Amino acid sequence: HNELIHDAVLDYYGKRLATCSSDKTIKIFEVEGETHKLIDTLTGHEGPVWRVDWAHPKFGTILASCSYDGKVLIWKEENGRWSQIAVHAVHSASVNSVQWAPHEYGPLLLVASSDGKVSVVEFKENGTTSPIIIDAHAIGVNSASWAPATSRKFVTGGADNLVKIWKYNSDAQTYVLESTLEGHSDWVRDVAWSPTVLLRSYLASVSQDRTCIIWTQDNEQGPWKKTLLKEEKFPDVLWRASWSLSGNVLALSGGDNKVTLWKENLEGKWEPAG
Amino acid sequence: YTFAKFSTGSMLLTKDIVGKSGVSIKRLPTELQRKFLFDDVYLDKEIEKVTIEARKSNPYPQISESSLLFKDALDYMEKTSSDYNLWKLSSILFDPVSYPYKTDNDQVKMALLKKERHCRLTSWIVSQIGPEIEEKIRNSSNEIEQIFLYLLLNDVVRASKLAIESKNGHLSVLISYLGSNDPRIRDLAELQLQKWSTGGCSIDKNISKIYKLLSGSPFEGLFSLKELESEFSWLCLLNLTLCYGQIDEYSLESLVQSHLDKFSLPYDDPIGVIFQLYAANENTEKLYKEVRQRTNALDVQFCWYLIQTLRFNGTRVFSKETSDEATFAFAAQLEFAQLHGHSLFVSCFLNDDKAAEDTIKRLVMREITLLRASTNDHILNRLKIPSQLIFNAQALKDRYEGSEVQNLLDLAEMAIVTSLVQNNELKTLREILN
After folding, report:
1. Among A176, A181, A173, A174, CA closest to A214
2. How many Cα atoms sit within 13 Å of B304 on the Cβ side?
3. Which residues of A82-117 are buried (b: 16+ CB within 10 A; e: fewer)?
C-alpha cells in the first residue's frame, strides 16, 4: 500500500532512495536497478510528508524533510540506525519545499512554508540551528530553489504568482530581495534554477495556470527574458519542473500522467525531446 | 498529481504506483544512436590517438594533439550503411592525403595531392551513382544516349568503344578528350555548339549533350544540361562538373562550389551538407552554423568529430565557442548514456579552462566508483585527472559509506576520532610534521 507518494529523492551517488508519502512515513530504499530493497521506514510527522531531500555527503548522511505538520525534521543515519537529530518549525503553516544549498555554503537548508516565509537554517558548531528567516510571499510560498555560483542567491515561487530572486548581503545579514518576476495567473507551483555554468542562466517556472515560463538572464546585468515554453495551456495543471545537470534539459511534471522534456535549440526556443 | 526531478546521475524519477517504491528509475532515452560508442575498445584506441597536456591556467587535462581522422571510425561501421558513406566521403574530402613519392619542389607536391584527392572523390561518386545509371543504360533504346550515360559513369573508354561499335567513330575520337582539360578543345566544342544553336537545322539530342561535356561548362552554359536536374541524382550531375568541368583551373573546393551555385540541394541530405561544408572553405563555420539551424542531418557526435578533426589538422577554423558548444553537446549525450569515461574524454576538448575544470571535477567526484574498474578505466583516470581531484572524490565516497592516507596527502579531528596502534600513531605524527 502506497497509493500516493508526494516526493522522492536520490543521493549524490544514487544508492539510497528516500520516498515520502501522505501516511507521514518516509521510506528509505537500497536501490539496485530493478530491486529497491526497503531498508527503513521513518515515522515522525503529524501530516503528509511533502518533500524529502538528502544533503551533501560531506555532511555525513543527513536528510531534511518537510511535512504538513508545519515542522521541518532533520534526520540522520547513525551506525545503520536512523534518528531525528534536529527540527525547525518556525513556520505557522504547512511547509512545502526544503532544499539544501551548494556544499560550499556550509550545510545551509532552504525551507519554504505557507506562512509566506522562507528560512535558511545553519547548523553551528554544536550542531544546533541558527535560523535567519525572511518574508517571501503574501498568500504563501509553494516552492524555493537554490542557485549555484562562484553573491549567493535563490528563487521562490509564490501563491501570488510571483517568482522572486533573493541575494545574500553582509550589510543586512538577512537575504535581501533583488528581483521579482511576474508572469503567471495562478499559484506558482514549482521554480527551478539550472545548474548550467554556461554563458547564461535559466529558470523554469511551472504554474497552476498550466504554463511554464523560462527566465533566461543574459548575464549579471541585463534583466530576465520571459519565454512561455509553448504558447498553449497544458491539458492539466503543472506541478514540478526540474533541470538536468549535464545538458540543460528540462523535465516537466504535469498533472497529465506523463513527464515532458524540453531542450533549448539554436533558435533559443525550446523543443520537445524523448 | 505527478512529481519528477533530475537525478545526480542525470536520469529521471517519477510517480509510479506499479513498482515497489512508488517511483521509477528511468534510464533517460539517449539521442546518442551509434553502436560502437558503447564498446570500450573504441574509446581506448581513440585515447591512443591523443596527446594530453595540463592547462596554462589550471592543472586539468585538455587536448594538445589529436590524430583523429574520419578514416578511423570506418572500421567500426558497415561498409553498406549510409553512415559509412558519410564518414567515408568526409574522409576523402577532409582527411589529409599523403603522397609517398618524393617531389622536385613542393608546389608540385601540392598539385599531385590535388589530383589524387580529385581521383578518389570522383571514383567514389561513381561508386554511388553506379546502379542509377546502369538502370538507365538498361532501359535506353538509343545508342548515342548510352554513350552519354557511360560518360555519366566517368567511363571514357566504354563510351569511345560503343561509339566505335555503333559506327559513331568521330565522336569516339572526340570522347577520348574527356578528362584532359585541353582549353583548345573546350573553346572549339563550345564554338560548334553556338554554330548549331544559330541555324543548325537539327542536331541529335545526345551528341549536343556530349559536346557540352567537352565544353567544360555543362550547366554554366548556353546548351545547358541544367534541365537534367529532373532526370538525375544531384550527385550524378556534380560528377559531371567534377570530371570535365575545368579541373586544372579550379581548386577542388571552388569547382564544387561552382557546381553548387547552379543547383540547390535538398536541405535534409547529409552527403549534400558535407559537399557544401567542403566547398564553403573561406567560411565553413558560417555555413556550419547555417546548417545547424536548418537541418539535423549532422548528429551531435559527427559535428563534434568534424570540428575537432578540422581543428587539429589545420584543415579549417572554428570559434573556440563553436568547438566548445559541439563538445559540450556530445559530452552531455554521452553522460546521458552512462558513458562517463567517454564523456570525460570528450570534455577535455574544451577550450574554456574554467568550464573544463568544473565539468570534469563534478563528473569525477559524482562517478568515481565506476571510473576505477579495468585498465581501460585506468588509462582513463590516467588521462591527466589531477591527483587531488581523484583522491578528494575518493575521500568523499568514504565519508558517505562510513581514506586516511589520502587525508595525509575539523576533518582530520574526525578521522582521529574514528581511529580512537602505536605504530599508526607514530606514522600519523610523522605525516603531520611533514
Report:
1. A181
2. 22
3. beeebebebbeebbbbbbbbeeebebbbbbbbbbbb
- Cβ atoms within 10 Å, residue A135: 12
Amino acid occupying residue B23: V
Question: Is residue A271 within 8 Å of residue A265, measured between CB atoms?
Answer: yes
Interface list for A 168-207 with B (CB within 8 A): 197-198
Of B6, B292, B328, which is closest to A251 when you measure between CB atoms? B6
Give the separation between CA B365 and CA B358, rounded to whole angstroms.
Answer: 11
Give dist(CA A247, CA B7) in Å, integer.
13
Indicate which technique resolved this structure: cryo-EM
Q: Which residues pair with A264 in a beta bridge?
A: A270
Question: What letter does residue A163 receive in the DSSP assignment?
Answer: E
What is the layout of strands, in order, in the sheet containing B12-15?
B4-6, B12-15, B23-26
Inter-chain touch B22–A197, beta carbons under 8 Å: no
Tell me the three-class secondary structure of B19-85, residue by residue.
CCCCEEEECCCCCCCCHHHHCHHHHHHHHCCEEEEECCCCCCEEEEEECCCHHHHHHHCCCCCHHHH
CA B15 to chain A, closest CA, distance in angstroms equals 7
State how far the Cα of B140 lies from the Cα of A121, in Å rounded to an integer.
Answer: 85
Resolution of this entry in Å? 37.0
Place of cell 531542450: A263
* Residues followed by a gap in chain A, C→N > 2.5 Å: 150
Torsion, CA B427, CA B428, CA B432, CA B434, rounded to 10 = 20
* Cα A252 from Cα A140, distance rounded (Å): 22
Q: In this complex, do B293 and A8 lie within 8 Å of one another by their Cβ atoms?
A: no
CB B92 within 8 A of CB B116: no
Give me the residue label for grid cell 565519508. B399
Residues A69/A45, Cβ–Cβ less than 8 Å = yes
* Total residue length of chain B: 434
Instruction: Give CA–CA dist A135/B91, Å, rounded.
Output: 63
C-alpha cell at A130: 541558527
Q: Provide the 3-class DSSP secondary structure of residue A26.
A: strand
Do the bridges between strand A16-21 and strand A25-30 make them parallel or antiparallel, or are there none, so unpaired?
antiparallel
